Design a protein around this ligand. Structure first.
Ligand SMILES: CCCCCCCCCCCCCCCCCC(=O)OC[C@H](COP(=O)([O-])OCC(O)COP(=O)([O-])OC[C@@H](COC(=O)CCCCCCCCCCCCCCCCC)OC(=O)CCCCCCCCCCCCCCCCC)OC(=O)CCCCCCCCCCCCCCCCC
Lengths: 72, 61
């Protein structure tokens, strides 16, 4: 609780009470998720890091062209 | 390390390194391709000479 108080105090200038979080979470539906993702994640840039037996590893351009589907 | 091609210049790097690449390529091909070419061109010219002399020797009085 103390960690949450301090973290929210620094991040927002306040502490958000539970009821507010739940009320804002409730009203999100599928179309809203499908809007935000389309806003920030569709056809975006990505960064990659890895370690180990990376002979299999995909290309950067593969991961980047993955962010959109040609179907639809 | 690799950078996404959306965050790179991609026609300036080609011209920026043009003279070096062209020097290398042309230097590599001089002796092997051109010198025999020049000799062959020579031979064609000499053949033409021989023919244009023949055609008068054989058929002109
Ligand atoms: C002489 C005959 C010669 C015939 C040659 C034909 C050549 C065509 C090749 C087809 C394309 C390759 C297919 C491979 C798919 C691989 C499987 C897979 O997982 O794909 C997922 C992928 C779906 O994407 P995703 O899974 O969501 O995620 C994608 C990634 O995020 C990101 O994507 P990615 O990075 O992974 O890359 C995926 C890539 C995969 O490919 C590769 O990685 C390699 C590259 C593919 C080959 C490229 C060379 C092909 C040359 C194309 C031109 C051919 C013209 C032939 C004309 C003949 C003339 C005599 O697929 C493509 O992008 C292919 C796009 C091109 C296909 C669409 C063409 C249809 C246009 C129709 C317009 C209407 C015209 C009507 C008029 C009639 C015209 C005849 O599937 C596709 O979209 C592939 C194409 C699906 C086919 C769609 C329907 C085709 C029918 C067209 C209409 C027919 C007209 C006939 C009527 C005639 C009237 C008289």
């Amino acid at each position: 609780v103390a960690e949450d108080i301090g973290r929210q105090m620094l991040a927002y200038g306040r502490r958000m009470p539970l009821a507010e979080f739940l009320k804002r979470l409730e009203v999100i539906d599928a179309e809203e998720v499908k809007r935000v993702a389309w806003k920030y994640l569709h056809d975006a840039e990505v960064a990659v890091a890895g370690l180990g037996p990376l002979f299999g590893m995909p290309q950067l351009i593969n991961l980047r062209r993955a962010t959109f589907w040609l179907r639809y | 390390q690799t950078i996404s091609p959306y965050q790179l210049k991609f026609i300036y790097p080609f011209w920026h390194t043009f003279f070096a690449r062209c020097w290398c390529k042309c230097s590599a091909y001089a002796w092997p391709w051109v010198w025999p070419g020049l000799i062959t061109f020579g031979l064609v010219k000499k053949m033409n000479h021989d023919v244009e002399e023949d055609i008068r020797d054989h058929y002109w009085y």
